[PDB]
Design a protein around this ligand. Structure first.
Ligand SMILES: Nc1ncnc2c1ncn2[C@@H]1O[C@H](COP(=O)(O)OP(=O)(O)O)[C@@H](O)[C@H]1O
Ligand code: BEF
Ligand SMILES: [Mg+2]
Ligand SMILES: [Zn+2]
Ligand SMILES: [Zn+2]
Lengths: 585, 104, 670
């Protein structure tokens, strides 16, 4: 502690008292200096940089300071020591001095809190024991893995808020500094304060190499705080290891334990914190559940009951194998949860994103559309029948035909879309399967699309001046033309009907089909960008005759879309939207 | 330790002349780091709080950053960013209202 | 215990001076919107303050100049930015107020100061100028400066010193104009959808329910380079503050309060064009939002009328600020353009509350919204415990599919619904609330300039002080280099040592920004490099060639005789990095083999980016063979420096371009 013992620095100023504020360490400044995080986060860190002990600055930090926060050049300090302010207002000097010294006295009183001395004796002792990689030293390095630091943060930010409640902001900032993670949004640090967090480490990555030092140092540093612990197969190795390390780097006269049961660490007082083991089956404050994929009933009840307490943080650190990665007890929890469980995985969701997290693997052991956009897409649907004023007066329909039956890729995709504000909305979807050996496949497909259109038209009467129809002809030009002809004729029983036309290479003829080639990549590229930013949605009253006996049409479309890296519906939807050169009558 | 405001007090004397005559002189000592108070009184009767003053200072900034992007640069990628941000916020607020209209 | 180290008092004085300068640059950003007839009244104060800043950045100019060349610090960077921007804006505002009273025009003065006709001064070029080609980008936004700084930290092992200092100066010259205000961060340069370097560091660390981190950096608003500052403003603000105004005669104050009491006695019409689903007739949420916005408009207009009346009473002149002199361009904006900017008498928090008091009303889902902690708690509890016919059929299926859709929205998908509603609320708050600034840009700028200036300072500081026996000029150094090469190309790598080479390799390929290995809670160089490599989006076909670059009589003799750190032949940013990795792996394996064959001494293969300065101007470069990343003098071996550590009269060093020449000269001198 050096920056807390600084004199007044008279430092007169012109701002009225109705505005000025008192920042610690420095004198009284105008109120704007408390709103700008450019100066606030500097005048707040150069002070808390003194509470941080000398064993938590780093490996190479400077001689006797955190040289990357408090370093003035040997010429700037000599040029600054010759700066002098107004120094005074005789009627106003005493109140400002009183306020500054009162804030600094609040800080100094925070420095002397026994509960803060315990937190220091914890974090400093941890960063010191870690220098030897947690050997049996009585008290080439022992770097922590990522999750082996997340567990420490989850324990320390909790025990800080529990043991030191009257210093929430100051201890929050002190821990932000001591973990060397400043300028962290308070939402994350608040998330660290939560209880009942779940970990999932692969075996042989190190979970017991780090727990028993965490347990030992959360015992010996803090006072009067118990520590729960439970496992299925009767914890004996971890218990004996805790005994060993505690008797090693502390007086063995202090530790007292009965095999497979309570371990207790002595103190000058009668604090006597305990590690009572719940493996063999009050206030615990840790309850380190060491295995959470193998529990037997009537043992989950103690864990469900300790959740009713306000001081326990049940840490579900449990190993995985990747041969049973989808644990019947935890990996399902990731479905309905929010910042609860954090997996430690190096082969992520897909079969091989391993190259991404490859450098992240331990050295000792040697999706085009975003999910959020998909969830937002299916989750929110606009009601088109009641917001018709937001729609453009043109419908665009794309038909991606397959002219076979009794195959899984024999489905015909149909999409009916339009503009909604400046976005795109789907009015209808079909995934249509020819009846085998019909004599009229084009008319069957045409009847399908006409039925879809009609329903869309009836749901929004008078909304549309034009419907523009594209029939993909890649499969068969003649068959595509036949579909257009039947659509043309059937629709003849208001909105004008126009077909996209194509002049095939070497031809002068304009056929009512669409040839998908060079425009595919631009269409897909635009769709992906629009979809991901929330610009493509489905009508709340979306129409589908063919997706009405097994699955929700929007849900079904999204399953096809999530294959981007049977595609008839995806292609029809993406192309109908791309359409929304001139097509004609 | 004589202050700069009780050092020079006279007619316009364009700023560089003052710099030349008073502070750039090497024979000076350069004490008196006391600033002055430049915010007027007609701006405190209507915005009588650093919070209200900051809110007004931000409102006028958000307006100026709209007037400049509304000779034919015509792209000014800041302008395209400011149009994309507005067209995103419009859709986002509309869907935030519509979703809670639907939740009932 | 009485005397405190003089650097501490100097730092406190600098903090006070930074606060004063920030206050001054706030008064400046106020007088840029005030009526010119009042700027002319505050002209002497502004001139005095401009003189003060001028005389101030001359007592600190040599100091800050020496500081920039030796271990920059966030305090010094912020002070430099604020001093320079305050000087700039002081001179500009004084010039624009003295231009006024020659034209007598207010609209012209406002188009000048607030910059309504300036040609977009937020463009800049860098010209990184690495080896193997000079890649140049263009800083436009703030996240672009952040991306460039991370890119420089990543490709730090190729760019030379002076090129990096030039690029960093051309970046600081843009930060002076962007981060110079430090208080309002104009919206022309801010894209919160782009996550900065700390969003990744706090997404790796927080919970990740599956959801590979690359899939979470798309929804984040990043909340760090532009904060929110949560401004709050009372309803009867001026009436609370008019009785106790400063420098007002009691009679004038009384009649002003009388005029106030007497005078106290948006584009809502464009809401129907918004896509409003649900029932059309009845109490809906769009009508509630319209009523809330109408109430807020009433409050703001009432406050404005009261302010005009009280100004007519006190001073007698209806002042013309930037919201009353440009009221023509205002009051004509659409609903969204009035929501984004507006409310000089309300606060963006009042708009948020006026929207949310309309959304959340009279309703399961609200319980999950108000307290997600209890929601995850009950989730964990549950887990532990366990043509005519066409029209009619269209109506019927749309009925039975709206029913099913509502049933899903009430029963399932509640995780997705909660997440989406929270994210929409965040995207609203980040847009409305007043973005002030962030503390990420000066931090990263200092962290990168520190490493580069440290490399330059070591290159310049080991110049003399003793014998400087150089091996870049080769009299016969071939004879002693090829011998050592053949003597080290003979032994095996002894894979029992690979867990040390794989660490002392990533400890050199890393950058100076992401320490993550000297935190005293150090993480291995694996993650310390995974940060500096994944942040700057790297091709996955290159990320595996970092990890698997040591698993494998060649491949540790890839250097030529004299050209070890020389990329004369190759060009690009990926192949230059590959050759750099080859040369660094070669140096590491050569050092390891030299230790495993000869027992002369230790080398420890240190880097100049370390050795932070002490309380004053002391560096104490320890003995060892450094890398120095300098194609003009790559290898510098300090065989023995001094009893204290600093490079003194007995600090004989050995320059060399040739790794094996260094490994032989070390043995000869030790
Ligand atoms: N980052 C690391 N720091 C320290 N030890 C590590 C690290 N990574 C791996 N280890 C080693 O891994 C082992 C830890 O295994 P352990 O946690 O007992 O496995 P399990 O998860 O199956 O219980 C120890 O030998 C330890 O030295
Ligand atoms: F990796 Be183990 F628990 F055998
Ligand atoms: Mg084991
Ligand atoms: Zn521009
Ligand atoms: Zn960010």
């Amino acid at each position: 502690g050096d920056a807390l013992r600084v004199p007044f620095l008279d430092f007169a100023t012109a701002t009225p008292k109705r505005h000025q504020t008192v920042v610690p360490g420095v004198g009284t400044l105008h109120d704007c200096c408390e709103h700008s995080p450019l100066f606030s986060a500097v005048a707040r860190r150069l002070l808390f940089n003194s509470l941080v002990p000398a064993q938590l600055k780093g490996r190479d930090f400077g001689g006797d300071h955190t040289a990357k926060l408090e370093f003035l050049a040997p010429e700037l300090v000599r040029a600054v020591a010759r700066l002098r302010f107004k120094e005074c207002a005789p009627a106003d000097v005493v109140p400002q001095r009183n306020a500054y010294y009162s804030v600094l006295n609040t800080f100094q009183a925070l420095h002397r809190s026994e509960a803060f001395r315990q937190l220091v004796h914890f974090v400093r002792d941890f960063a010191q024991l870690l220098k030897t990689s947690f050997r049996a030293s009585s008290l080439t390095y022992g770097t922590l893995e990522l999750f082996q630091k997340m567990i420490l943060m989850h324990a320390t930010y909790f025990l800080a808020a529990v043991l030191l409640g009257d210093h929430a902001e100051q201890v929050n900032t002190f821990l932000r500094l001591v973990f060397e993670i400043p300028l962290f949004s308070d939402a994350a640090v608040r998330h660290f304060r939560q209880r009942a967090t779940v970990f999932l480490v692969p075996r042989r990555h190190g979970k017991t190499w780090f727990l028993v030092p965490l347990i030992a140092l959360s015992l010996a540093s803090f006072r009067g705080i118990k520590i729960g612990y439970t496992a299925h197969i009767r914890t004996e190795p971890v218990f004996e290891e805790i005994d060993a390390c505690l008797r090693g780097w502390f007086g063995s006269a202090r530790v007292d334990h009965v095999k497979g049961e309570t371990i207790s660490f002595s103190f000058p007082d009668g604090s006597r914190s305990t590690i009572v083991f719940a493996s063999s089956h009050q206030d615990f404050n840790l309850l380190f559940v060491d295995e959470a994929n193998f529990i037997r009933p009537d043992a989950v009840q103690t864990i469900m009951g300790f959740l009713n307490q306000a001081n326990c943080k049940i840490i579900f650190v449990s190993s995985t194998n990747t041969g049973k990665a989808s644990t019947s007890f935890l990996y399902n929890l990731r479905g309905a949860a929010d910042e609860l469980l954090n997996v430690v995985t190096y082969i992520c969701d897909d079969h091989m994103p391993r190259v991404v997290t490859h450098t992240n693997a331990t050295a000792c052991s040697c999706p085009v559309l975003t999910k959020s956009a998909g969830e937002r897409f299916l989750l929110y649907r606009p009601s088109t029948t009641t917001n018709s004023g937001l729609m453009a007066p043109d419908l665009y329909v794309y038909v991606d035909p397959a002219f076979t039956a009794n195959t899984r890729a024999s489905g015909t995709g149909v999409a009916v879309v339009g503009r909604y504000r400046d976005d795109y909305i789907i009015f209808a979807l079909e995934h249509f399967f020819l009846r085998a050996l019909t004599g009229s496949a084009p008319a069957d497909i045409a009847r399908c699309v006409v039925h879809s259109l009609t329903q869309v038209l009836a749901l929004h009467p008078g909304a549309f001046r034009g419907v523009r129809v594209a029939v993909e002809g890649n499969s068969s030009q003649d068959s595509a033309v036949a579909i257009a002809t039947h659509v043309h004729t059937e629709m003849h029983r208001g909105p004008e009907l126009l077909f996209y036309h194509c002049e095939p290479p070497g031809s002068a003829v304009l056929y009512p089909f669409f040839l998908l080639n060079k425009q595919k990549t631009p269409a897909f590229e635009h769709f992906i960008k629009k979809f991901n930013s929330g610009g493509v949605m489905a009508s709340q009253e979306i129409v589908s005759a063919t997706v009405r006996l097994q699955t929700d049409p929007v849900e079904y479309l999204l399953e096809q879309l999530n294959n981007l890296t049977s595609d008839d519906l995806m292609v029809a939807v993406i192309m109908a939207i791309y359409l929304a050169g001139p097509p004609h009558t | 330790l004589r202050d700069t405001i009780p050092d020079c007090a006279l007619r316009s004397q364009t700023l560089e002349s003052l710099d030349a005559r008073y502070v750039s002189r090497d024979g000076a000592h350069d004490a008196a780091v006391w600033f002055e108070d430049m915010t007027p009184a007609e701006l405190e009767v209507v915005f009588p709080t650093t919070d209200a003053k900051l809110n007004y200072l931000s409102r006028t900034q958000r307006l100026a950053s709209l007037l400049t992007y509304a000779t034919p640069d015509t792209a000014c990628v800041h302008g395209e960013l400011l149009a994309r941000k507005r067209e995103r916020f419009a859709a986002v607020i509309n869907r935030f209202l519509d979703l809670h209209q639907i939740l009932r | 215990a009485a005397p405190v180290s003089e650097p501490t008092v100097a730092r406190q004085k600098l903090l006070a001076l930074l606060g004063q300068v920030q206050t001054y640059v706030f008064q400046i950003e106020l007088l840029r919107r005030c009526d010119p007839h009042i700027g002319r009244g505050k002209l002497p104060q502004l001139k005095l303050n401009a003189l003060q800043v001028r005389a101030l950045r001359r007592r600190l100019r040599p100091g800050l100049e020496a500081q920039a060349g030796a271990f920059l610090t966030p305090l010094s960077v912020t002070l430099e930015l604020l001093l320079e921007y305050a000087w700039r804006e002081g001179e500009r505002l004084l010039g624009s107020l003295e231009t006024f009273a020659t034209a007598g025009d207010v609209a012209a003065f406002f188009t000048e100061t607030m910059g309504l006709a300036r040609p977009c001064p937020y463009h800049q070029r860098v010209r990184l100028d690495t080896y193997g080609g000079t890649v140049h980008m263009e800083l436009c936004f703030l996240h672009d400066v952040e991306n460039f700084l991370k890119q420089l930290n990543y490709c730090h092992l190729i760019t030379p010193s002076r090129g990096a200092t030039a690029a960093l100066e051309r970046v600081r010259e843009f930060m002076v104009g962007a981060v110079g205000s430090g208080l309002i961060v104009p919206p022309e340069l801010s894209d919160p959808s782009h996550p900065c370097a700390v969003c990744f560091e706090e997404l790796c660390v927080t919970a990740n329910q599956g959801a590979t981190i690359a899939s979470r950096l798309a929804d984040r608003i990043c909340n760090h380079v532009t904060q929110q500052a949560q401004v709050r403003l009372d309803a009867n603000e001026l009436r609370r503050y008019l009785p106790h105004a400063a420098g007002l005669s009691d009679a004038d104050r009384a009649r002003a309060l009388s005029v106030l009491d007497h005078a106290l006695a948006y584009a809502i019409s464009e809401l129907q064009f918004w896509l409003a689903s649900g029932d059309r007739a009845g109490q809906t949420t769009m009508d509630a939002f319209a009523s809330n916005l109408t109430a807020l408009a009433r409050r703001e207009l009432q406050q404005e009328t009261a302010a005009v009346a009280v100004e007519l009473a006190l001073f007698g002149r209806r002042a013309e600020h930037f919201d009353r002199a440009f009221g023509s361009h205002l009051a004509a904006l659409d609903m969204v353009d009035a929501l984004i900017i507006g409310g000089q008498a309300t606060s963006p928090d009042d708009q948020i509350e006026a929207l949310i008091r309309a959304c959340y009303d009279h309703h399961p889902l609200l319980r999950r919204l108000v307290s997600p902690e209890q929601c995850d708690e009950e989730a964990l509890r549950r887990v532990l415990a366990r043509w005519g016919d066409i029209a009619t059929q269209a109506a019927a299926d749309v009925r039975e599919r709206r029913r099913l859709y509502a049933d899903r929205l009430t029963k399932r998908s509640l995780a997705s619904l909660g997440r989406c509603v929270r994210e929409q609320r965040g995207e609203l708050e980040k847009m409305l609330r007043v973005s002030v600034h962030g503390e990420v840009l000066p931090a990263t700028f200092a962290a990168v300039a520190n490493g580069f200036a440290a490399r330059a300072r070591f290159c310049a500081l080991t110049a003399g002080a003793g014998t400087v026996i150089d091996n870049r000029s080769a009299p016969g150094v071939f004879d002693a280099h090829r011998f050592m090469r053949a003597s080290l190309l003979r032994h095996q790598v002894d894979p029992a040592l690979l867990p040390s080479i794989t660490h002392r390799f990533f400890e050199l390929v890393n950058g100076p920004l992401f320490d993550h290995s000297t935190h005293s809670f150090a993480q291995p160089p694996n993650t310390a490099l995974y940060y500096s490599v994944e942040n700057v989006g790297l091709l996955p076909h290159l990320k595996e060639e970092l990890a698997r670059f040591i698993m494998g009589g060649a491949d540790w003799a890839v250097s030529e005789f004299q050209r070890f750190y020389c990329f004369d032949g190759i060009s690009g940013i990926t192949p230059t990095q590959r050759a750099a990795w080859r040369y660094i792996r070669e140096l590491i394996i050569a050092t390891t083999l030299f230790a495993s064959v000869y027992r002369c001494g230790e080398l420890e293969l240190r880097r100049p980016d370390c050795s932070r300065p002490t309380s004053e101007g002391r560096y104490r470069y320890p003995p060892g063979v450094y890398l120095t990343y300098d194609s003009d003098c790559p290898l510098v071996a300090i065989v023995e420096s001094a009893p204290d550590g600093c490079i003194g009269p007995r600090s004989v060093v050995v320059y060399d371009r040739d790794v094996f020449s260094i490994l032989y000269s070390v043995l000869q001198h030790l």
